[PDB]
Amino acid sequence: SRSYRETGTMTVTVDALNVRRAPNTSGEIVAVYKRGESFDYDTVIIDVNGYVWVSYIGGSGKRNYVATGATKDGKRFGNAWGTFK
Numbered sequence: 001s002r003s004y005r006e007t008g009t010m011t012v013t014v015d016a017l018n019v020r021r022a023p024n025t026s027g028e029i030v031a032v033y034k035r036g037e038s039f040d041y042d043t044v045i046i047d048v049n050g051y052v053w054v055s056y057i058g059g060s061g062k063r064n065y066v067a068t069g070a071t072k073d074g075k076r077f078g079n080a081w082g083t084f085k
Contacts, residue, residue, distance in 0.1 A: 001047045002074065010054055010068060010082040011038040017081060023053040023065040030064065039066075048074050 001023070012033045020027030023045045033039065041054035043063070051067035058064050069080035 001045050001050065004044045004046070005042065006044050007040065007042050008054070009038055009040050009085045010066070011085075012036065012082045014081045017066050017068075019064045019066055021062060021064065023047075023051075023055070023067075027065060030058075033066065041066075046074060047071050052076060052080075 012035055015035050017033045018029045019031035019033065020029055022028070039056065041056045043055040045053040045055065045065070047053070048071065050071055052069050052071055053065045053067055055063055055065045068082050070077045
């Protein structure tokens with residue numbers, strides 16, 4: 001995967017997305033965003049064949065990760081799971 005710094009806002013457009021403590025499907029779940037909720041991020045992780053994760057620092061200083069769509073060959077593939085501003 002490739003990690004980048006970038007600030008932005010995501011608005012969730014799928015029913016729900018898990019907030020995890022690692023950018024993989026085994027990362028500990030610490031929250032859930034629902035359809036229509038928005039949150040800011042400062043870091044983006046682009047899996048080669050996985051997901052685009054966005055990440056923010058929480059209240060305890062630990063980093064949180066949310067998957068935002070699939071990737072193929074290091075690029076977004078298919079429709080994203082939120083809108084971005």
